[PDB]
Design a protein around this ligand. Structure first.
Ligand SMILES: Oc1cc(-c2ccccc2)nc2nnnn12
Ligand SMILES: Oc1cc(-c2ccccc2)nc2nnnn12
Ligand SMILES: Oc1cc(-c2ccccc2)nc2nnnn12
Ligand SMILES: [Zn+2]
Ligand SMILES: [Zn+2]
Lengths: 351, 349
């Protein structure tokens, strides 16, 4: 039964037009912040990474923006055999490095880097008069435009180097998107977002947000997938429904605090794993949406039970490790998803 | 019947290993010429566009030398949708090619002369191999070298423009139902080249790079020719069409009719057949004989009707009566039809 699923997708599609006006407010504020950030020597080569402007299917008043900063000849040192967290050290000596001010030894400080970023942003939001902009407290930088629109702003270092060795056996798209696409994609840059690891406040985590967008917007085995009536698939619709399932349950149990650790990234990672399992476009037929979404729900639940959700790019990194998410939280999310699946998804009818 | 076709392809595949040694000699000479060419102010940003990787000629290599030109303005010559005059848009800073300006227009002749002059000067200086420069024949194959008395290298100069493709290409590259519209959008965002081809002041459009991309990523499916269940015969049909023309051109070299026909005509016609048959199922390995017969058949229709449109410039007809006379197309038709009727005797060896 896909009827109620297709009904949800149409209701979600009705929020599309309002996202245009809201994006206009965000484009204004972000263009301003990038003009003022480019004035500082450190953040001179700062730019917009070119994806979002949504990241929450039930949130037109929520936008995510990424600010790329190209870093020239960098050396990475993997922190404590975590295949995702690294220390950013510099390789060349000439000429003087613009980020020298944030070096806490030979290692670039994430904390000192993000503090200056937060400081310049706090300073420039008071000077912008077009709209009312407030900066939200530490929980990278979240703004609130005209008391409605929230903007999550991330700083990401860009490296045009070859991807770290931890990614060598990841991105298993060879039997789905082809090995020739995998070769082309790995030649693209990689990003590092400042994220500390279990209290190491000097580490950076790998980011492949750009590759995830490429793979989602060119998602079929066939190059003409979703370009004609005979080749329409339900891949994107399954992801939208999985994302919405978690958002609705997270909203339902916001006062409980269990589901706070789960994100749309867990849903998206699990979705790419199901795409690797079902490489044929015939396995994603529009008529089979109900059955396709049930495999996605089912795979996601297996990851929760087995406490195993590997990062799509870093196979050895487990997003569902007991050290990251406690078993009782995964058991609560399992309980809730199973109830929903057993009662024809009541949480879809805004519950 | 594909047996004799598959046999020819295996014999052509046996020339592959010798092409490695020969390419080594060419990589040496070309890397030298590019190092010396980069010394001149005009040809500073010169680079190789990478063709050094005729199906019956391992002692014959073609190389393209790209040169990026910044803010160029094109003026279409006499409603030819392929020939253009190269002008420059901005004023600051001074243009490195100012020496070749024959008015506000960049001279092809003055540009190619300096190119031929630096190349003639550097072939005498380079050691460890005997290199001779062959005399003028055509404007498109611009400078021809002869390494160690065996290897011929055709060196072409091409201007690179990162601008949007001219309006004459707007309705070309009909790969939307085969390679997808999203690929067509990605491909058109790439640069375009202009090779000096004459009116001895014009430049012709070149999309050699797009032809290579389309040939090396040729299926509807992204995994086409990456597994036993997805092996196609597209490349093999092109290799056989190219070899059919080369063998007939050799046979009638003393007659002079087929001199105007090139592998580009065969390749253009092949891309038109790919547009007609967008499905990988239409190019099954088992159906090679039937696939090659459609290619032969389409090519013959173009010869009879005197109509072979450029794959990128629809309004440009490569088989125009003004380019190739009717009696020459009729001779090539006669010969191809005889070959097809007698199980291709020109193939066997
Ligand atoms: O782009 C990303 C990346 C990651 C991430 C987590 C663990 C290891 C590696 C990468 N998590 C994320 N959560 N939201 N976005 N997002
Ligand atoms: O790349 C090309 C392009 C052309 C060509 C001919 C007529 C109009 C436009 C372009 N002809 C060619 N012959 N060999 N290569 N090659
Ligand atoms: O080599 C040939 C060629 C032809 C032939 C016929 C019509 C037009 C052109 C060529 N016919 C032939 N009959 N025997 N040999 N043979
Ligand atoms: Zn699709
Ligand atoms: Zn193929």
């Amino acid at each position: 039964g896909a009827s109620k699923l297709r009904a949800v997708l149409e209701k979600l599609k009705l929020s599309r037009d309002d996202i245009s006006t809201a994006a206009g407010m965000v484009k204004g504020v972000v263009d301003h912040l990038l003009l003022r950030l480019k004035c500082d020597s450190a953040f001179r080569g700062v730019g917009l990474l070119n994806t979002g402007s949504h990241v929450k299917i039930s949130a037109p008043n929520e936008f995510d923006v990424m600010f790329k900063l190209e870093v020239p000849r960098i050396q990475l040192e993997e922190y404590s055999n975590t295949r995702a967290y690294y220390f950013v050290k510099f390789k060349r000596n000439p000429k003087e490095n613009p980020l020298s001010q944030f070096l806490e030894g030979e290692i670039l400080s994430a904390s000192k880097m993000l503090s200056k970023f937060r400081k310049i942003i706090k300073e420039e939001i008071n000077d912008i008069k077009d709209t009312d902009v407030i900066m939200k407290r530490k929980r990278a930088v979240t703004l609130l435009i005209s008391e409605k629109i929230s903007v999550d702003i991330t700083l990401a270092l860009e490296s045009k180097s070859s991807w770290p060795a931890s990614t060598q056996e990841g991105l298993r798209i060879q039997n789905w998107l082809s090995a020739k696409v995998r070769k082309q994609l790995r030649l693209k840059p990689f990003y590092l977002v400042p994220k500390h690891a279990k209290f190491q406040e000097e580490t950076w985590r790998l980011s492949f947000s750009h590759i995830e967008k490429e793979i989602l917007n060119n998602h079929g085995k066939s190059k003409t997938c979703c370009e004609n009536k005979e080749e329409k698939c339900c891949r994107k619709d399954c992801l939208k429904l999985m994302k919405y399932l978690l958002e609705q349950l997270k909203e339902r149990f916001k006062d409980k605090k269990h589901l706070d650790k789960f994100s749309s990234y867990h849903v998206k990672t699990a979705f790419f794993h199901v795409c690797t399992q079902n490489p044929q476009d015939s396995q994603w037929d529009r008529k089979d949406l109900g059955l396709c979404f049930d495999n996605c729900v089912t795979y996601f639940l297996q990851c929760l039970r087995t406490e195993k959700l590997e990062n799509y790019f870093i196979p050895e990194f487990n997003l569902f490790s007991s050290n990251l998410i406690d078993k009782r939280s995964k058991e609560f999310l399992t309980k809730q998803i199973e109830y929903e699946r057993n009662n024809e998804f009541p949480v879809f009818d805004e519950f």
